């Protein structure tokens, strides 16, 4: 072939293990398709039994033993510390002298090249960049609504009296209260619940990311407002009105929920969320989940906390043991070519998609199998989060008229919060960050849990968690930061 990388067949090691749940696997489609165009054959070497991506990760660094390339999801921090301590090596001069895809796509996206981009100024890692504006939306049962009497909650007040007749009020009709008001795949997302009180839960599509407010840089979870708004969160577990197992339910929330006619409402993304009225159609007859205008908060604003982040702290990155590098960051670079792109995004020609009229379209039954198209992509080893550059219209062929309409609702009505875009460490500051940040976030998570599951009372317990964040360095990390931001802007 023409695209091929090498002349000699070529096979390298990654390890690559992503949301919890997938590794890498050979023999997936797309992966076949890719090894025949270029001539280079990615194996798995990642443990596929084990549920922990950032502790696999860990174990495998931990035990010095590398393969060729390291994938996976939010990784960016461990690739560009390990980068910079060598067990990745740089790709400046490698992308410069092989990968003329790679270098047209930086020089057109300069923001995304310095999103990569390390303190010493070295890019150790390849991106996943989406490609669209809004991501998540609020989606409320409409017909439970209607059948209940009641409007679109408008406010935080209102929402809570629906929710309430949600829980309350038997809307599937089973004379159980089996009723569950608000659901969501992501844990995370609970946490976003302190929004409707005017706290903060992330400043990004990233979880737990900083926020920029008045030239002043903040964590959501260190500020008073995330004390008083996640009262009210544990309040509302307390009451039954958030999924009991918001924690544990994860990924099939809503097939569980929604398919179950037992969930009222969500924050999800538009595309696969809006799916549900078509999947479910027929098995529930007058099911209709729609999106809502975020609620009216305690600040007086609407908020949508949320939106696609270009580029991911998701790809990945080569090895200093990776004794084929040139072979290698040509391989990276065939991803964002037009052939690469087509592949990662729609998978292989002739199985899930066909060009018609010079444009890559979705099959019918892909499109009609009434399960999410990026559930599907991963499956064939599309969609996943490797180097690769997404494209839009990819998901615009499976985004229906209700998707539309709640991403044209957030889009023209102005919801969608500025989001933080990171600011520039020194390597010294740097330091201070990977030194404490990793800690602290997972204290922060931990106590964010107990106090929604009403184990440890906010107000109780608050002037000893931040006595916790000074010992841990919390503080430290939010001198660094704020001097980046002084420095930047
Ligand atoms: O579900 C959708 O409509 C969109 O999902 C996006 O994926 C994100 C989602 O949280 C997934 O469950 C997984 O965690 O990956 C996330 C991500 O890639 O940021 C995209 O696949 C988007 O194209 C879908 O339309
Ligand atoms: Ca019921």
């Given at each position: 072939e023409a695209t091929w990388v090498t002349e000699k067949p070529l096979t390298l090691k990654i390890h690559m293990h992503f949301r919890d749940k997938w590794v890498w696997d050979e023999n997936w489609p797309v992966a076949r398709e890719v090894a025949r165009l270029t001539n280079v054959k990615l194996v798995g070497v990642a443990n596929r039994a084990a549920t922990n991506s950032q502790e696999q990760f860990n174990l495998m660094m931990a035990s010095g033993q590398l393969p060729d390339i390291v994938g996976g999801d939010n990784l960016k921090d461990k690739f560009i510390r390990y980068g910079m301590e060598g067990a990745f090596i740089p790709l400046n001069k490698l992308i410069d002298q092989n990968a003329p895809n790679l270098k047209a796509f930086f020089k057109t996206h300069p923001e995304v090249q310095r999103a990569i981009t390390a303190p010493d100024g070295n890019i150790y890692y390849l991106p996943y960049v989406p490609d669209g504006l809004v991501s998540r939306g609020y989606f409320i049962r409409q017909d439970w609504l209607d059948k209940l009497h009641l409007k679109t909650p408008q406010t935080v007040d209102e929402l809570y009296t629906v929710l309430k007749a949600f829980k309350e009020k038997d809307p599937n009709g089973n004379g159980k209260a089996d009723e569950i008001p608000f659901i969501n795949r992501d844990p995370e997302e609970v946490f976003r619940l302190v929004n409707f009180w005017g706290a903060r839960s992330t400043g990004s599509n990233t979880w737990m990311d900083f926020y920029v407010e008045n030239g002043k840089i903040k964590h959501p979870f260190a500020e008073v407002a995330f004390k008083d708004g996640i009262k009210h969160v544990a309040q509302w577990y307390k009451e039954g009105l958030?999924?009991?197992?918001?924690?544990?339910?994860?990924?099939r929330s809503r097939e569980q929920t929604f398919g179950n006619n037992i969930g009222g409402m969500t924050h999800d993304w538009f595309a696969s969320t809006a799916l549900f009225n078509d999947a479910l159609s027929k098995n529930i007859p007058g099911f209709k989940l729609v999106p809502m205008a975020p609620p009216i908060n305690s600040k007086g604003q609407r908020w949508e906390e949320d939106a696609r982040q270009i580029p991911r702290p998701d790809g990945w990155a080569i090895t200093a043991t990776n004794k084929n590098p040139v072979e290698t960051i040509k391989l990276f670079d065939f991803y964002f070519g037009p052939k690469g792109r087509e592949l990662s995004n729609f998978g292989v020609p002739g199985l899930t998609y066909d060009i018609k009229n010079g444009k890559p379209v979705y099959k019918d039954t892909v499109l009609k199998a009434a399960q999410p198209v990026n559930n599907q992509m991963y499956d064939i080893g599309a969609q996943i989060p490797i180097g690769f550059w997404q494209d839009y219209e990819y998901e615009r062929q499976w985004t229906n008229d209700v998707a539309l309409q709640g991403i044209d609702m957030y889009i023209k009505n102005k919801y969608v919060l500025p989001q933080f875009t990171g600011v520039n460490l020194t390597v010294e500051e740097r330091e201070i960050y990977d030194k404490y940040w990793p800690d602290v976030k997972t204290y922060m998570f931990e106590m964010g849990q107990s106090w929604v599951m009403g184990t440890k009372d906010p107000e109780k317990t608050w002037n000893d968690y931040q006595q916790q964040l000074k010992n841990r360095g919390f503080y430290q990390v939010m001198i660094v930061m704020q001097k980046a931001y002084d420095r930047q802007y």
């Open positions: 958030i999924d009991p197992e918001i924690f544990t339910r994860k990924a």
